[model samples]
Target chain A: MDEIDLRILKILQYNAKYSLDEIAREIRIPKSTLSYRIKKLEKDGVIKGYYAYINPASLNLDYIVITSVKAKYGKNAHVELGNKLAQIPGVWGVYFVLGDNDFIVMARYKTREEFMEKFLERVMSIPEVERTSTQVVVKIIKESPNIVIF
Target chain B: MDEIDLRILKILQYNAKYSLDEIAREIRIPKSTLSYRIKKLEKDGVIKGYYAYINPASLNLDYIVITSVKAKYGKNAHVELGNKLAQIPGVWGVYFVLGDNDFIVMARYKTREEFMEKFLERVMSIPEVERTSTQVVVKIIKESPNIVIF
Candidate 1:
């Protein structure tokens, strides 16, 4: 990607509502070229989707927990377990990390009861799962998908 | 928030580009009411902002690391340290948890050098910072800010 493409992405990442004319003006490029560039970026999968950045707290989806899972060794055990964790509705972030834990998963709930009922059981029930460690975030100092482009 | 509000939010969270009329049809509400509800949601701080969900990997932003930080006890130490960590360029998620670790932080970088030079040093230099344990995510199976609304 070139500097111009990067500029467009930076602008869009923060606020996707900016019009073609506005982005074009800021980048000092023609509106049509700006439009074409963004279209191409989306087509190429650099810009995946546009979304409304909702505050989970307002919706009572702010009870966040991070769980580390240990799995019984098997062929692609991590992969199988990661998929299972990801399928759970509230489990938004899951990663395969090489550490004492095989995978790290981030899940949210409206209440602790939901965590015990809807979440913890699913993990413990998995036949391949061996152990789990969890940390309930007392305070979410910062949790964002937003990333700086530069 | 009622069923209509939740429906609109669900639609917007998935695709913010949808027209008001489109959302209205799906939720079976008048276009004007739909627009009004959305405006109220934004005004109420439920919808924070619109964003283009760019793929980090496509931009060489896929290198993810999770760090558990311990801090020296002080008045509002977590708050002070959290604000400092939040100011860093690539640190996207940080939380104060009731566990062995005082804070959990998620950061991304294009290279290990940047992580060491830009991220790790900053956390260590803080006088209140005591210790840190890090796990580099070998593979990110699913990492998103999207929430499934009921």
Candidate 2:
């Protein structure tokens, strides 16, 4: 919310492992104040979580696709469908969106064959899902969870 | 690469704040071995980097969209367009993909008006950009940089 808070977030967004002392030094704030701001940010859900970016290729899960789904509109349709997609092992992220598609989900698989058999067949066959479109990513130029603070 | 390596990645993917001693204890690997494997992973680009997940909504960035783009096909067209899209400030991710669209990009903006004037207008006007389809995200159900290592 404040300048110092945004600065702390910018530092952490690139590398969350930076110690309180390091972040404090960089921002020219006292260590205690920096720590307090981070904790408050976490509590407020601004700083959601810290994570390591693991290359799917290293794990032999190289196939990545974005699947847009159109579900039958019913009571709690979005919530029910979103939760279902999120629970799938291969599904990395699921979002309810305002568009022709109800949900857009990102999933990864070991191979194209596996992607079709496992992700496509499994997700598309769900009764709630009406239509789906899958786009496989050939190359990732840049992928990060960070948003531009400025 | 190995079971131990995967375990270390899993722990870090969820929370990278774990110290070496703590990771060693949890994975039941010796501190030295764990440290060595981590270094190797980093060197190999398996563990890309550590990052903090910040909620864009908290920053008053309510507009989030997935824009699928079509580019004028030429030598190095995909690469050229992807790198350009990635360089844009609000574009968090840019992927050259296989499907109807040449690229799939995720972008965030402070408001609908800004999203239109800044992202849509700017991206579509690029000569390499033939067409674009934008889908606004209503809510994010689940998102993580981690892939299933197992």
Candidate 3:
């Protein structure tokens, strides 16, 4: 990702649906060069694909839960754990990360009771799950794919 | 807010950047009709401006917390509480609901401790906040604004 590529990504991060011509106009790059560059970036997988940011609340899904997992690192537990967790319904996203926790799981449920009785219990039951911590989302403040071009 | 308007929204929700001609084609309506419908939807505030869905994990923002609020009903506190929650840095989205929890918040933080120490405290301090529950997002399985289209 060079400087120019980064700028293009920044623009796409702002709005992936921007037309090739509009993108050309934004960074003052010629449409042809910019198009070729974007194609290269996509081929290289820097710009993977476009996705949507839906307001989950609008869908009547009110339960939001985050859980941290510390797997027996480097024992293939991470891959196994992640694969199994992915199968759970209402699981929105997963992250393999550093810091206090090795992995984080974001899920939505109809209610907390349902989450606790069904989802969390099932997760805890999974072997190699050394320890787990959970947090329920209260209010969302800032969220965007809008990366800073700089 | 009519049926056709809902149809338009359901489509645009998936890809807000859809071209007028594309929309017309998909909806099987004339281009001018689709244009008028979109204008009406935007005028009615159902179609907010388009935005990107950046990958928080890529940006080192891997942790997501979902907290539910139990607020007293029929008070100005609901309005104030929402406003306060929205003001928090890293807060992504908030929802008022008629469910077990009064509201749900989706928030992001650079680190786990920061989310617990700083963001949670600010949220708990909001007036009329009866009780709050939180979940730390671990894995987001499936997410899309592509609502079930009829």
- Which candidate order results from sorting by TM-score in descending order? 1, 2, 3
* Candidate 2, pairs of clashing residues: none
Model 2 DockQ vs. reference: 0.74
For candidate 1, give the DockQ.
0.78
Candidate 3 positional error at B9, Å: 9.1
lDDT score of residue B115 within candidate 1: 90
lDDT of each: 0.85, 0.84, 0.66
Order of models, best DockQ first:
1, 2, 3
Q: Candidates' DockQ values? A: 0.78, 0.74, 0.19
> Candidate 1 has which clashing residue pairs, if any?
none
Complex DockQ, candidate 3: 0.19
| Interface RMS deviation of candidate 2 | 1.9
Better of 2 and 3 by lDDT: 2
Q: Which 10 consecutive residues of model 1 chain B have the lowest summed lDDT?
A: B141-150
Taking chain A of candidate 2, what TM-score results? 0.87
Docking class of 3: incorrect
Report the error of model 2 at residue A60, Å. Answer: 2.1
lDDT of 2 by residue, A72-126 (tens): 9888876788899888878878988876658999888899898888788888778
True contacts kept of each: 0.83, 0.90, 0.24
Q: What is the TM-score of chain A alone in each candidate?
A: 0.94, 0.87, 0.78
TM-score per candidate, in order? 0.96, 0.92, 0.54
Error of 1 at B70 (Å): 0.4
